[PDB]
PDB file of C-alpha atoms and ligand atoms in Angstrom:
ATOM      1  CA  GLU A   1     -11.256  -8.658 -23.245  1.00  0.00           C
ATOM      2  CA  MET A   2      -9.148  -7.458 -20.763  1.00  0.00           C
ATOM      3  CA  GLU A   3      -6.026  -8.391 -22.951  1.00  0.00           C
ATOM      4  CA  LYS A   4      -7.232  -5.365 -25.444  1.00  0.00           C
ATOM      5  CA  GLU A   5      -7.925  -3.096 -22.346  1.00  0.00           C
ATOM      6  CA  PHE A   6      -4.335  -3.998 -20.660  1.00  0.00           C
ATOM      7  CA  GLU A   7      -2.404  -2.883 -24.045  1.00  0.00           C
ATOM      8  CA  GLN A   8      -4.487   0.262 -24.489  1.00  0.00           C
ATOM      9  CA  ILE A   9      -3.687   1.106 -20.746  1.00  0.00           C
ATOM     10  CA  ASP A  10       0.304   0.219 -21.398  1.00  0.00           C
ATOM     11  CA  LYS A  11      -0.044   2.270 -24.782  1.00  0.00           C
ATOM     12  CA  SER A  12      -1.589   5.365 -22.679  1.00  0.00           C
ATOM     13  CA  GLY A  13       0.636   4.762 -19.780  1.00  0.00           C
ATOM     14  CA  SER A  14      -2.329   5.393 -17.368  1.00  0.00           C
ATOM     15  CA  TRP A  15      -1.719   2.787 -14.856  1.00  0.00           C
ATOM     16  CA  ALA A  16      -0.856   5.430 -12.100  1.00  0.00           C
ATOM     17  CA  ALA A  17      -3.809   7.885 -13.028  1.00  0.00           C
ATOM     18  CA  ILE A  18      -6.174   4.763 -12.885  1.00  0.00           C
ATOM     19  CA  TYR A  19      -4.943   3.979  -9.532  1.00  0.00           C
ATOM     20  CA  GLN A  20      -4.975   7.590  -8.081  1.00  0.00           C
ATOM     21  CA  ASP A  21      -8.644   7.189  -9.033  1.00  0.00           C
ATOM     22  CA  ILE A  22      -9.037   4.145  -7.393  1.00  0.00           C
ATOM     23  CA  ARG A  23      -7.473   5.632  -4.185  1.00  0.00           C
ATOM     24  CA  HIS A  24     -10.066   9.077  -4.516  1.00  0.00           C
ATOM     25  CA  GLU A  25     -12.918   6.935  -5.034  1.00  0.00           C
ATOM     26  CA  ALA A  26     -12.286   4.206  -2.469  1.00  0.00           C
ATOM     27  CA  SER A  27     -14.795   3.954   0.635  1.00  0.00           C
ATOM     28  CA  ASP A  28     -14.234   5.657   3.696  1.00  0.00           C
ATOM     29  CA  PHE A  29     -15.930   4.266   6.593  1.00  0.00           C
ATOM     30  CA  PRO A  30     -15.294   4.611  10.361  1.00  0.00           C
ATOM     31  CA  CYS A  31     -12.573   2.892  12.392  1.00  0.00           C
ATOM     32  CA  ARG A  32     -13.327   3.935  15.840  1.00  0.00           C
ATOM     33  CA  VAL A  33     -12.747   0.736  17.829  1.00  0.00           C
ATOM     34  CA  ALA A  34      -9.444   0.594  16.088  1.00  0.00           C
ATOM     35  CA  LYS A  35      -8.553   3.833  17.456  1.00  0.00           C
ATOM     36  CA  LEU A  36      -9.615   3.334  20.823  1.00  0.00           C
ATOM     37  CA  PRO A  37      -6.308   4.062  23.225  1.00  0.00           C
ATOM     38  CA  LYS A  38      -6.972   0.620  24.756  1.00  0.00           C
ATOM     39  CA  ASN A  39      -6.355  -0.913  21.100  1.00  0.00           C
ATOM     40  CA  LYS A  40      -3.124   1.090  20.517  1.00  0.00           C
ATOM     41  CA  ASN A  41      -0.426  -1.707  21.312  1.00  0.00           C
ATOM     42  CA  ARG A  42      -2.516  -4.145  18.903  1.00  0.00           C
ATOM     43  CA  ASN A  43      -2.219  -2.069  15.768  1.00  0.00           C
ATOM     44  CA  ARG A  44       1.065  -2.933  13.700  1.00  0.00           C
ATOM     45  CA  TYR A  45       0.714   0.573  11.846  1.00  0.00           C
ATOM     46  CA  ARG A  46      -1.434   3.755  12.880  1.00  0.00           C
ATOM     47  CA  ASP A  47      -2.553   4.278   9.304  1.00  0.00           C
ATOM     48  CA  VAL A  48      -3.687   1.033   8.432  1.00  0.00           C
ATOM     49  CA  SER A  49      -6.925   0.207  10.394  1.00  0.00           C
ATOM     50  CA  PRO A  50      -9.954  -2.316  10.053  1.00  0.00           C
ATOM     51  CA  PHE A  51     -13.448  -0.715   9.072  1.00  0.00           C
ATOM     52  CA  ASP A  52     -15.755  -1.057  12.019  1.00  0.00           C
ATOM     53  CA  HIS A  53     -18.420  -2.386   9.969  1.00  0.00           C
ATOM     54  CA  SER A  54     -16.261  -5.565   8.532  1.00  0.00           C
ATOM     55  CA  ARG A  55     -13.671  -6.157  11.730  1.00  0.00           C
ATOM     56  CA  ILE A  56     -13.239  -9.578  12.921  1.00  0.00           C
ATOM     57  CA  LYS A  57     -14.528  -9.692  16.407  1.00  0.00           C
ATOM     58  CA  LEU A  58     -12.692 -11.876  18.708  1.00  0.00           C
ATOM     59  CA  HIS A  59     -15.053 -14.106  20.967  1.00  0.00           C
ATOM     60  CA  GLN A  60     -13.968 -12.456  24.310  1.00  0.00           C
ATOM     61  CA  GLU A  61     -15.341 -10.331  27.174  1.00  0.00           C
ATOM     62  CA  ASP A  62     -12.249  -8.289  28.068  1.00  0.00           C
ATOM     63  CA  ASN A  63     -11.507  -6.980  24.364  1.00  0.00           C
ATOM     64  CA  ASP A  64     -12.756  -8.134  21.162  1.00  0.00           C
ATOM     65  CA  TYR A  65     -10.291  -6.042  18.963  1.00  0.00           C
ATOM     66  CA  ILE A  66      -7.880  -7.641  16.390  1.00  0.00           C
ATOM     67  CA  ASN A  67      -6.692  -5.549  13.348  1.00  0.00           C
ATOM     68  CA  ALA A  68      -8.532  -8.074  10.712  1.00  0.00           C
ATOM     69  CA  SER A  69     -11.104  -7.532   8.227  1.00  0.00           C
ATOM     70  CA  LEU A  70     -13.691  -9.870   6.597  1.00  0.00           C
ATOM     71  CA  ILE A  71     -13.748  -9.206   2.942  1.00  0.00           C
ATOM     72  CA  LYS A  72     -17.145 -10.919   1.419  1.00  0.00           C
ATOM     73  CA  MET A  73     -17.182 -11.042  -2.083  1.00  0.00           C
ATOM     74  CA  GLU A  74     -20.868 -11.997  -2.819  1.00  0.00           C
ATOM     75  CA  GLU A  75     -20.812 -12.748  -6.610  1.00  0.00           C
ATOM     76  CA  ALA A  76     -17.632 -14.560  -6.338  1.00  0.00           C
ATOM     77  CA  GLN A  77     -18.902 -16.539  -3.645  1.00  0.00           C
ATOM     78  CA  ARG A  78     -15.526 -16.373  -1.555  1.00  0.00           C
ATOM     79  CA  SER A  79     -14.778 -14.594   1.881  1.00  0.00           C
ATOM     80  CA  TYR A  80     -11.135 -13.645   3.057  1.00  0.00           C
ATOM     81  CA  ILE A  81     -10.027 -12.433   6.201  1.00  0.00           C
ATOM     82  CA  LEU A  82      -7.171 -10.068   5.719  1.00  0.00           C
ATOM     83  CA  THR A  83      -5.043  -8.959   8.816  1.00  0.00           C
ATOM     84  CA  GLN A  84      -1.892  -7.421   9.557  1.00  0.00           C
ATOM     85  CA  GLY A  85       1.263  -9.602  10.549  1.00  0.00           C
ATOM     86  CA  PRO A  86       0.681 -10.493  14.049  1.00  0.00           C
ATOM     87  CA  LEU A  87       2.640  -8.251  16.820  1.00  0.00           C
ATOM     88  CA  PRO A  88       4.441 -10.148  19.618  1.00  0.00           C
ATOM     89  CA  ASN A  89       1.308  -9.480  21.840  1.00  0.00           C
ATOM     90  CA  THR A  90      -1.464 -10.305  19.408  1.00  0.00           C
ATOM     91  CA  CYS A  91      -0.132 -14.068  18.170  1.00  0.00           C
ATOM     92  CA  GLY A  92      -2.804 -15.605  20.652  1.00  0.00           C
ATOM     93  CA  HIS A  93      -5.478 -13.345  19.160  1.00  0.00           C
ATOM     94  CA  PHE A  94      -4.391 -14.154  15.738  1.00  0.00           C
ATOM     95  CA  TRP A  95      -4.847 -18.044  16.364  1.00  0.00           C
ATOM     96  CA  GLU A  96      -7.834 -17.165  18.494  1.00  0.00           C
ATOM     97  CA  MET A  97      -9.488 -15.797  15.221  1.00  0.00           C
ATOM     98  CA  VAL A  98      -8.272 -18.673  13.256  1.00  0.00           C
ATOM     99  CA  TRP A  99      -9.952 -21.075  15.777  1.00  0.00           C
ATOM    100  CA  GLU A 100     -13.255 -19.116  15.939  1.00  0.00           C
ATOM    101  CA  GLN A 101     -13.696 -18.240  12.417  1.00  0.00           C
ATOM    102  CA  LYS A 102     -13.043 -22.091  11.320  1.00  0.00           C
ATOM    103  CA  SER A 103     -10.136 -21.141   9.088  1.00  0.00           C
ATOM    104  CA  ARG A 104      -8.220 -24.070   7.645  1.00  0.00           C
ATOM    105  CA  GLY A 105      -5.664 -22.126   5.905  1.00  0.00           C
ATOM    106  CA  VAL A 106      -3.305 -19.073   6.432  1.00  0.00           C
ATOM    107  CA  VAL A 107      -1.608 -17.467   3.549  1.00  0.00           C
ATOM    108  CA  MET A 108       1.745 -15.540   4.426  1.00  0.00           C
ATOM    109  CA  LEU A 109       3.090 -13.035   1.755  1.00  0.00           C
ATOM    110  CA  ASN A 110       5.643 -11.476   3.511  1.00  0.00           C
ATOM    111  CA  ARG A 111       8.868 -12.357   5.493  1.00  0.00           C
ATOM    112  CA  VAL A 112       9.387 -11.651   9.078  1.00  0.00           C
ATOM    113  CA  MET A 113      12.337  -9.486   8.470  1.00  0.00           C
ATOM    114  CA  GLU A 114      12.725  -7.684   5.321  1.00  0.00           C
ATOM    115  CA  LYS A 115      15.314  -4.863   4.673  1.00  0.00           C
ATOM    116  CA  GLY A 116      16.592  -5.343   8.300  1.00  0.00           C
ATOM    117  CA  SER A 117      13.521  -4.681   9.792  1.00  0.00           C
ATOM    118  CA  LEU A 118      10.772  -6.830  11.524  1.00  0.00           C
ATOM    119  CA  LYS A 119       7.664  -6.939   9.732  1.00  0.00           C
ATOM    120  CA  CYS A 120       5.509  -9.603  11.304  1.00  0.00           C
ATOM    121  CA  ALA A 121       5.943 -11.769  14.599  1.00  0.00           C
ATOM    122  CA  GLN A 122       7.202 -15.249  14.535  1.00  0.00           C
ATOM    123  CA  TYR A 123       3.595 -16.553  14.877  1.00  0.00           C
ATOM    124  CA  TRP A 124       3.952 -20.281  14.138  1.00  0.00           C
ATOM    125  CA  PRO A 125       6.668 -22.972  15.049  1.00  0.00           C
ATOM    126  CA  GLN A 126       9.604 -23.379  12.822  1.00  0.00           C
ATOM    127  CA  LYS A 127      10.700 -26.776  14.394  1.00  0.00           C
ATOM    128  CA  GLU A 128       8.644 -29.785  14.898  1.00  0.00           C
ATOM    129  CA  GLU A 129       9.611 -30.410  18.588  1.00  0.00           C
ATOM    130  CA  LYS A 130       9.158 -26.600  19.790  1.00  0.00           C
ATOM    131  CA  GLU A 131       5.423 -26.290  19.903  1.00  0.00           C
ATOM    132  CA  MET A 132       3.772 -23.114  20.815  1.00  0.00           C
ATOM    133  CA  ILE A 133       1.355 -22.304  23.543  1.00  0.00           C
ATOM    134  CA  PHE A 134      -0.677 -19.302  23.531  1.00  0.00           C
ATOM    135  CA  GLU A 135      -1.315 -19.031  27.399  1.00  0.00           C
ATOM    136  CA  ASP A 136      -3.970 -15.948  26.747  1.00  0.00           C
ATOM    137  CA  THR A 137      -6.387 -17.619  24.255  1.00  0.00           C
ATOM    138  CA  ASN A 138      -5.350 -21.407  25.716  1.00  0.00           C
ATOM    139  CA  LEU A 139      -4.342 -22.829  21.929  1.00  0.00           C
ATOM    140  CA  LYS A 140      -1.589 -25.246  21.356  1.00  0.00           C
ATOM    141  CA  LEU A 141       0.243 -25.042  17.823  1.00  0.00           C
ATOM    142  CA  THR A 142       2.390 -27.851  16.409  1.00  0.00           C
ATOM    143  CA  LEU A 143       4.558 -27.867  13.214  1.00  0.00           C
ATOM    144  CA  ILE A 144       3.666 -31.306  11.807  1.00  0.00           C
ATOM    145  CA  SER A 145       5.587 -31.189   8.493  1.00  0.00           C
ATOM    146  CA  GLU A 146       6.820 -28.712   5.905  1.00  0.00           C
ATOM    147  CA  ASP A 147       7.281 -28.615   1.871  1.00  0.00           C
ATOM    148  CA  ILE A 148      10.038 -26.227   1.257  1.00  0.00           C
ATOM    149  CA  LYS A 149      10.190 -24.738  -2.557  1.00  0.00           C
ATOM    150  CA  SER A 150      12.620 -22.112  -3.919  1.00  0.00           C
ATOM    151  CA  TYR A 151      10.428 -19.315  -3.025  1.00  0.00           C
ATOM    152  CA  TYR A 152       7.466 -20.418  -0.802  1.00  0.00           C
ATOM    153  CA  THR A 153       6.822 -23.114   1.812  1.00  0.00           C
ATOM    154  CA  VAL A 154       3.731 -24.663   2.767  1.00  0.00           C
ATOM    155  CA  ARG A 155       3.589 -25.926   6.446  1.00  0.00           C
ATOM    156  CA  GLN A 156       1.087 -28.478   7.833  1.00  0.00           C
ATOM    157  CA  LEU A 157       0.044 -27.258  11.560  1.00  0.00           C
ATOM    158  CA  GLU A 158      -1.909 -28.669  14.046  1.00  0.00           C
ATOM    159  CA  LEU A 159      -3.783 -26.282  16.327  1.00  0.00           C
ATOM    160  CA  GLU A 160      -5.495 -27.889  19.313  1.00  0.00           C
ATOM    161  CA  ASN A 161      -8.277 -25.799  21.729  1.00  0.00           C
ATOM    162  CA  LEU A 162      -6.816 -26.528  25.056  1.00  0.00           C
ATOM    163  CA  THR A 163     -10.006 -25.922  26.505  1.00  0.00           C
ATOM    164  CA  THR A 164     -11.906 -28.659  24.427  1.00  0.00           C
ATOM    165  CA  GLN A 165      -8.925 -30.810  23.368  1.00  0.00           C
ATOM    166  CA  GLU A 166     -10.127 -30.632  19.640  1.00  0.00           C
ATOM    167  CA  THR A 167      -7.588 -30.250  16.984  1.00  0.00           C
ATOM    168  CA  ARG A 168      -7.615 -29.104  13.401  1.00  0.00           C
ATOM    169  CA  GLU A 169      -5.157 -29.082  10.797  1.00  0.00           C
ATOM    170  CA  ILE A 170      -4.359 -25.605   9.541  1.00  0.00           C
ATOM    171  CA  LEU A 171      -2.278 -25.275   6.176  1.00  0.00           C
ATOM    172  CA  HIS A 172       0.349 -22.425   6.127  1.00  0.00           C
ATOM    173  CA  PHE A 173       0.963 -21.260   2.752  1.00  0.00           C
ATOM    174  CA  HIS A 174       4.297 -18.762   2.761  1.00  0.00           C
ATOM    175  CA  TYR A 175       5.347 -16.789   0.022  1.00  0.00           C
ATOM    176  CA  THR A 176       8.758 -15.636   0.568  1.00  0.00           C
ATOM    177  CA  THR A 177       9.876 -13.609  -2.031  1.00  0.00           C
ATOM    178  CA  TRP A 178       7.522 -10.803  -2.207  1.00  0.00           C
ATOM    179  CA  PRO A 179       8.807  -7.529  -1.180  1.00  0.00           C
ATOM    180  CA  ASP A 180       7.089  -4.838   0.868  1.00  0.00           C
ATOM    181  CA  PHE A 181       5.325  -2.614  -1.840  1.00  0.00           C
ATOM    182  CA  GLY A 182       6.892  -4.755  -4.760  1.00  0.00           C
ATOM    183  CA  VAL A 183       5.265  -7.258  -6.959  1.00  0.00           C
ATOM    184  CA  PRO A 184       5.890 -10.988  -7.630  1.00  0.00           C
ATOM    185  CA  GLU A 185       8.800 -12.287  -9.582  1.00  0.00           C
ATOM    186  CA  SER A 186       6.264 -13.187 -12.526  1.00  0.00           C
ATOM    187  CA  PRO A 187       2.613 -14.000 -13.113  1.00  0.00           C
ATOM    188  CA  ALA A 188       3.656 -17.620 -13.399  1.00  0.00           C
ATOM    189  CA  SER A 189       5.421 -17.612 -10.011  1.00  0.00           C
ATOM    190  CA  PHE A 190       1.965 -15.759  -8.416  1.00  0.00           C
ATOM    191  CA  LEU A 191      -0.477 -18.255 -10.326  1.00  0.00           C
ATOM    192  CA  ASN A 192       1.708 -21.407  -9.269  1.00  0.00           C
ATOM    193  CA  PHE A 193       1.516 -20.115  -5.604  1.00  0.00           C
ATOM    194  CA  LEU A 194      -2.560 -19.196  -5.889  1.00  0.00           C
ATOM    195  CA  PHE A 195      -3.290 -22.347  -7.440  1.00  0.00           C
ATOM    196  CA  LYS A 196      -1.482 -24.613  -4.612  1.00  0.00           C
ATOM    197  CA  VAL A 197      -3.479 -23.066  -2.347  1.00  0.00           C
ATOM    198  CA  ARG A 198      -6.841 -23.663  -4.350  1.00  0.00           C
ATOM    199  CA  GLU A 199      -5.816 -27.206  -4.677  1.00  0.00           C
ATOM    200  CA  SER A 200      -5.358 -27.668  -1.178  1.00  0.00           C
ATOM    201  CA  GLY A 201      -8.866 -27.704  -0.022  1.00  0.00           C
ATOM    202  CA  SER A 202      -8.428 -24.566   2.552  1.00  0.00           C
ATOM    203  CA  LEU A 203     -10.561 -22.444   0.390  1.00  0.00           C
ATOM    204  CA  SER A 204     -13.597 -24.823   0.625  1.00  0.00           C
ATOM    205  CA  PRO A 205     -16.835 -23.262   1.191  1.00  0.00           C
ATOM    206  CA  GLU A 206     -17.387 -25.804   4.282  1.00  0.00           C
ATOM    207  CA  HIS A 207     -14.317 -24.009   5.918  1.00  0.00           C
ATOM    208  CA  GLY A 208     -14.399 -20.455   7.259  1.00  0.00           C
ATOM    209  CA  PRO A 209     -12.615 -17.664   5.299  1.00  0.00           C
ATOM    210  CA  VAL A 210      -8.805 -18.343   4.383  1.00  0.00           C
ATOM    211  CA  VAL A 211      -6.826 -15.836   6.442  1.00  0.00           C
ATOM    212  CA  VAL A 212      -4.422 -13.784   4.029  1.00  0.00           C
ATOM    213  CA  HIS A 213      -1.824 -11.533   5.640  1.00  0.00           C
ATOM    214  CA  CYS A 214       1.556  -9.530   4.804  1.00  0.00           C
ATOM    215  CA  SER A 215       3.037  -6.700   6.800  1.00  0.00           C
ATOM    216  CA  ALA A 216      -0.242  -4.389   6.867  1.00  0.00           C
ATOM    217  CA  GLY A 217      -2.573  -6.774   5.340  1.00  0.00           C
ATOM    218  CA  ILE A 218      -3.194  -4.399   2.564  1.00  0.00           C
ATOM    219  CA  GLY A 219      -0.889  -4.390  -0.220  1.00  0.00           C
ATOM    220  CA  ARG A 220       0.500  -7.719  -0.960  1.00  0.00           C
ATOM    221  CA  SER A 221      -2.746  -9.355   0.404  1.00  0.00           C
ATOM    222  CA  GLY A 222      -4.946  -7.150  -1.379  1.00  0.00           C
ATOM    223  CA  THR A 223      -3.065  -8.039  -4.597  1.00  0.00           C
ATOM    224  CA  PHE A 224      -3.565 -11.658  -3.981  1.00  0.00           C
ATOM    225  CA  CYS A 225      -7.136 -11.382  -3.316  1.00  0.00           C
ATOM    226  CA  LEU A 226      -8.289  -9.196  -6.048  1.00  0.00           C
ATOM    227  CA  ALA A 227      -6.485 -11.774  -8.500  1.00  0.00           C
ATOM    228  CA  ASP A 228      -8.554 -14.613  -7.181  1.00  0.00           C
ATOM    229  CA  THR A 229     -11.610 -13.204  -6.816  1.00  0.00           C
ATOM    230  CA  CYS A 230     -11.560 -11.895 -10.462  1.00  0.00           C
ATOM    231  CA  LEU A 231     -10.363 -15.312 -11.771  1.00  0.00           C
ATOM    232  CA  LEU A 232     -13.218 -16.501  -9.657  1.00  0.00           C
ATOM    233  CA  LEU A 233     -15.330 -14.280 -11.591  1.00  0.00           C
ATOM    234  CA  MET A 234     -14.133 -15.181 -15.096  1.00  0.00           C
ATOM    235  CA  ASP A 235     -15.293 -18.720 -14.339  1.00  0.00           C
ATOM    236  CA  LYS A 236     -18.619 -17.881 -12.977  1.00  0.00           C
ATOM    237  CA  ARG A 237     -19.221 -15.303 -16.028  1.00  0.00           C
ATOM    238  CA  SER A 238     -16.343  -8.545 -19.035  1.00  0.00           C
ATOM    239  CA  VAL A 239     -14.487  -8.643 -15.526  1.00  0.00           C
ATOM    240  CA  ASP A 240     -13.855  -4.784 -14.722  1.00  0.00           C
ATOM    241  CA  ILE A 241     -10.566  -5.217 -12.253  1.00  0.00           C
ATOM    242  CA  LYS A 242     -11.036  -1.300 -11.200  1.00  0.00           C
ATOM    243  CA  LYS A 243     -14.829  -1.916  -9.907  1.00  0.00           C
ATOM    244  CA  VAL A 244     -13.732  -5.295  -8.168  1.00  0.00           C
ATOM    245  CA  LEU A 245     -11.278  -3.869  -6.145  1.00  0.00           C
ATOM    246  CA  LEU A 246     -13.223  -0.845  -5.354  1.00  0.00           C
ATOM    247  CA  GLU A 247     -15.850  -3.513  -3.838  1.00  0.00           C
ATOM    248  CA  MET A 248     -13.096  -5.072  -1.822  1.00  0.00           C
ATOM    249  CA  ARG A 249     -12.172  -1.424  -0.648  1.00  0.00           C
ATOM    250  CA  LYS A 250     -15.501  -1.445   0.757  1.00  0.00           C
ATOM    251  CA  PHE A 251     -14.370  -3.973   3.466  1.00  0.00           C
ATOM    252  CA  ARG A 252     -10.809  -2.848   4.415  1.00  0.00           C
ATOM    253  CA  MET A 253      -8.769   0.237   3.058  1.00  0.00           C
ATOM    254  CA  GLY A 254      -5.771   0.600   1.003  1.00  0.00           C
ATOM    255  CA  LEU A 255      -6.019  -2.824  -0.912  1.00  0.00           C
ATOM    256  CA  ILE A 256      -3.265  -2.662  -3.667  1.00  0.00           C
ATOM    257  CA  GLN A 257      -0.517  -0.512  -2.402  1.00  0.00           C
ATOM    258  CA  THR A 258       0.917   0.740  -5.898  1.00  0.00           C
ATOM    259  CA  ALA A 259       0.067   1.234  -9.328  1.00  0.00           C
ATOM    260  CA  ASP A 260       2.423  -1.365 -10.171  1.00  0.00           C
ATOM    261  CA  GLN A 261       0.939  -3.865  -8.006  1.00  0.00           C
ATOM    262  CA  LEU A 262      -2.496  -2.912 -10.100  1.00  0.00           C
ATOM    263  CA  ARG A 263      -0.599  -3.765 -13.450  1.00  0.00           C
ATOM    264  CA  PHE A 264       0.529  -7.005 -12.137  1.00  0.00           C
ATOM    265  CA  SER A 265      -3.029  -7.831 -10.837  1.00  0.00           C
ATOM    266  CA  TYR A 266      -4.343  -7.441 -14.610  1.00  0.00           C
ATOM    267  CA  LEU A 267      -1.100  -9.552 -15.885  1.00  0.00           C
ATOM    268  CA  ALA A 268      -1.988 -12.373 -13.199  1.00  0.00           C
ATOM    269  CA  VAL A 269      -5.672 -12.624 -14.122  1.00  0.00           C
ATOM    270  CA  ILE A 270      -5.003 -12.478 -17.939  1.00  0.00           C
ATOM    271  CA  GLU A 271      -2.533 -15.425 -17.569  1.00  0.00           C
ATOM    272  CA  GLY A 272      -4.377 -17.252 -15.239  1.00  0.00           C
ATOM    273  CA  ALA A 273      -7.548 -17.017 -17.443  1.00  0.00           C
ATOM    274  CA  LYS A 274      -5.920 -19.297 -19.733  1.00  0.00           C
ATOM    275  CA  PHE A 275      -6.304 -22.014 -17.424  1.00  0.00           C
ATOM    276  CA  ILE A 276      -9.828 -20.916 -16.654  1.00  0.00           C
ATOM    277  CA  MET A 277     -10.755 -21.362 -20.534  1.00  0.00           C
ATOM    278  CA  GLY A 278      -9.542 -24.749 -20.427  1.00  0.00           C
ATOM    279  CA  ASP A 279      -5.655 -25.054 -21.403  1.00  0.00           C
ATOM    280  CA  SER A 280      -4.049 -28.053 -19.214  1.00  0.00           C
ATOM    281  CA  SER A 281      -0.588 -27.346 -19.931  1.00  0.00           C
ATOM    282  CA  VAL A 282      -0.289 -23.772 -18.681  1.00  0.00           C
ATOM    283  CA  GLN A 283      -0.153 -24.845 -15.073  1.00  0.00           C
ATOM    284  CA  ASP A 284       2.936 -27.046 -15.354  1.00  0.00           C
ATOM    285  CA  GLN A 285       4.166 -24.125 -17.526  1.00  0.00           C
ATOM    286  CA  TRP A 286       3.855 -21.753 -14.433  1.00  0.00           C
ATOM    287  CA  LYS A 287       5.457 -24.342 -12.090  1.00  0.00           C
ATOM    288  CA  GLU A 288       8.576 -24.555 -14.886  1.00  0.00           C
ATOM    289  CA  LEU A 289       8.894 -20.876 -14.933  1.00  0.00           C
ATOM    290  CA  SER A 290       8.440 -20.507 -11.304  1.00  0.00           C
ATOM    291  CA  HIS A 291      11.633 -22.530 -10.590  1.00  0.00           C
ATOM    292  CA  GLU A 292      10.281 -23.928  -7.342  1.00  0.00           C
ATOM    293  CA  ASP A 293      12.480 -26.888  -7.483  1.00  0.00           C
TER     294      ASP A 293
HETATM  295  C1  C0A B   1       2.523   4.175   3.534  1.00  0.00           C
HETATM  296  N1  C0A B   1       2.277   3.536   5.046  1.00  0.00           N
HETATM  297  C2  C0A B   1       3.297   2.456   5.630  1.00  0.00           C
HETATM  298  O1  C0A B   1       4.210   2.392   4.873  1.00  0.00           O
HETATM  299  C3  C0A B   1       3.274   1.765   6.909  1.00  0.00           C
HETATM  300  C4  C0A B   1       1.769   0.845   6.846  1.00  0.00           C
HETATM  301  C5  C0A B   1       2.148  -0.154   5.639  1.00  0.00           C
HETATM  302  C6  C0A B   1       1.389   0.085   4.305  1.00  0.00           C
HETATM  303  C7  C0A B   1       1.219  -1.298   3.488  1.00  0.00           C
HETATM  304  C8  C0A B   1       2.402  -2.014   3.657  1.00  0.00           C
HETATM  305  C9  C0A B   1       2.284  -2.921   2.566  1.00  0.00           C
HETATM  306  F1  C0A B   1       2.000  -2.399   1.517  1.00  0.00           F
HETATM  307  F2  C0A B   1       3.768  -3.194   2.154  1.00  0.00           F
HETATM  308  P1  C0A B   1       1.748  -4.750   2.872  1.00  0.00           P
HETATM  309  O2  C0A B   1       2.150  -5.471   1.482  1.00  0.00           O
HETATM  310  O3  C0A B   1       0.243  -4.277   3.154  1.00  0.00           O
HETATM  311  O4  C0A B   1       2.147  -5.429   4.112  1.00  0.00           O
HETATM  312  C10 C0A B   1       3.199  -1.872   4.648  1.00  0.00           C
HETATM  313 BR1  C0A B   1       4.825  -3.117   4.760  1.00  0.00          BR
HETATM  314  C11 C0A B   1       3.100  -0.733   5.655  1.00  0.00           C
HETATM  315  N2  C0A B   1       2.880   2.910   7.739  1.00  0.00           N
HETATM  316  S1  C0A B   1       3.920   3.858   8.644  1.00  0.00           S
HETATM  317  C12 C0A B   1       3.990   5.251   7.611  1.00  0.00           C
HETATM  318  O5  C0A B   1       3.662   4.027   9.812  1.00  0.00           O
HETATM  319  O6  C0A B   1       5.225   3.011   8.817  1.00  0.00           O
HETATM  320 CL1   CL B   2     -10.125   2.805  25.284  1.00  0.00          CL
HETATM  321 CL1   CL B   3      10.001 -15.334   7.209  1.00  0.00          CL
HETATM  322 CL1   CL B   4      -4.525   3.535  -0.770  1.00  0.00          CL
END
């Protein structure tokens, strides 16, 4: 049981040691396309790149590159697309990816500004009457409605392919209180948000992979996806979180950026497992503890 495992790690004080092991054992794959001179202005950070083997390709002749990776968890039967916070020049590319990959959900775990510095472009409309048009990729994006809670907001967006005039509803799940290299306020706060995403339908296997991003698309995004995947495994199945993280790190570098994020992943999975094992009351308990109202 990982509860027994957790307390022993806490007792030995070995979180930093385990985390450093994970970094050492993590896959090292080439990112040659990301590092092409022509793609320099498409990367938010020089030290964060998608692997060639798992990168998302835009369906365009000129340049198919976007800083985004397909994480395909075979046993858990879920795929995620992890990407950086879009740049002012890659917002069109971002929504092109969403369209082409047929995603119906976007999970945002950062703020556009944190500690007085920009971490992400304003890639979605904040007001109904100010829709966005992405001329380079011929897409239109409209805010239809929003549901604002204390620490997260769920937005209903309409994405239109202007070429075909087909439209799709995209749900935008914005976690607003998760700082860079930090952790969520509580396991309850995180899990209340995660299951909101789960219950929305956005993660349906009939849809394309959910798009998850923060600023770099590795720390907070990695934490989110690790916890979700482990919970999936606990239901389908003795879950080895280090092993699952190393598996995910085959698809994108640097997933989970601090030892404390690793520790939090344990806490979240342990607490979330209560719901998995059949205790109804725990979900409304999270909601109360999250103080979303
Ligand atoms: C150490 N590298 C950096 O700080 C940045 C890249 C980076 C990596 C990870 C994050 C994050 F963990 F917070 P995430 O949750 O994934 O957004 C951030 Br923010 C930034 N590179 S640097 C040294 O060029 O500025
Ligand atoms: Cl080039
Ligand atoms: Cl924001
Ligand atoms: Cl790392």
